[PDB]
Design a protein around this ligand. Structure first.
Ligand code: HEC
Length: 112
């Protein structure tokens, strides 16, 4: 389970640098930031998957229709393709809970 074992707040400082070194290659998170390889993530926590305007998503991500929160985000980041088979996000995954917690802490702050 997720709504059992998952998110506990971590370091936003650390999470910002994990976003830079691991996610920035394909995504922006600031308000008004553009879509790149991956879509802009501003407001992601208040949204279902495959909904940013102007981005070409896979049919799988749309169909999955996940309402993003800390728990589903934690699962997707662990192994994106295991969580949404057919997704085109090419990211090996963040296997350590500590790393995922730092990153999500950062993301929930920056995406609002
Ligand atoms: C390029 C090599 C990527 C890296 C590095 C990361 N992501 Fe990504 N992401 C990428 C693509 C091409 C897509 C769309 C996938 C599809 O199947 O259509 C995504 C999607 C996401 C999403 C879903 C967004 C939505 O609007 O539903 C999220 C939440 C997301 N990506 C987050 C994310 C994070 C936090 C990353 C760093 C650990 C990261 N991605 C890496 C491409 C790439």
């Amino acid at each position: 389970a997720k709504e059992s074992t998952g998110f506990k707040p971590g370091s936003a400082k650390k999470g910002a640098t994990l976003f830079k070194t691991r996610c920035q290659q394909c995504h922006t998170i600031e308000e008004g930031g553009p879509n790149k390889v991956g879509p802009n993530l501003h407001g992601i926590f208040g949204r279902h998957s495959g909904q940013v305007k102007g981005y070409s998503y896979t049919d799988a991500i749309i169909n999955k229709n996940v309402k993003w929160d800390e728990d589903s985000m934690s699962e997707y980041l662990t192994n994106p393709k295991k969580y949404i088979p057919g997704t085109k996000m090419a990211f090996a995954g963040l296997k350590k809970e500590k790393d995922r917690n730092d990153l999500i802490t950062y993301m929930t702050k920056a995406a609002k």
